[PDB]
Amino acid sequence: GPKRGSIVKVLRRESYWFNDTGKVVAVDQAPGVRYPVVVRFDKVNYAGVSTNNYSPDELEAA
Q: Which residues bind another protein (CB under 8 A)?
A: 9, 12-20, 28, 32-35, 47, 49, 52-54
Instruction: Provide the minimum distance between the beta carbon of 15 and another protein in the complex, in angstroms, as a whole number.
Output: 5
Contacts of 32 (CB under 8 A, 6+ apart): none
Q: Exposed (0-12), middle (13-18) or buried (19+): which is 22, by Cβ within 10 Å?
A: buried
Instruction: Provide the minimum distance between the beta carbon of 6 and another protein in the complex, in angstroms, as a whole number.
Output: 17
How many Å apart are CA 14 and CA 35, to the nearest integer? 15
Nearer to another protein, 5 or 48 (CB): 48
Instruction: Provide the minimum distance between the beta carbon of 48 and another protein in the complex, in angstroms, as a whole number.
Output: 9
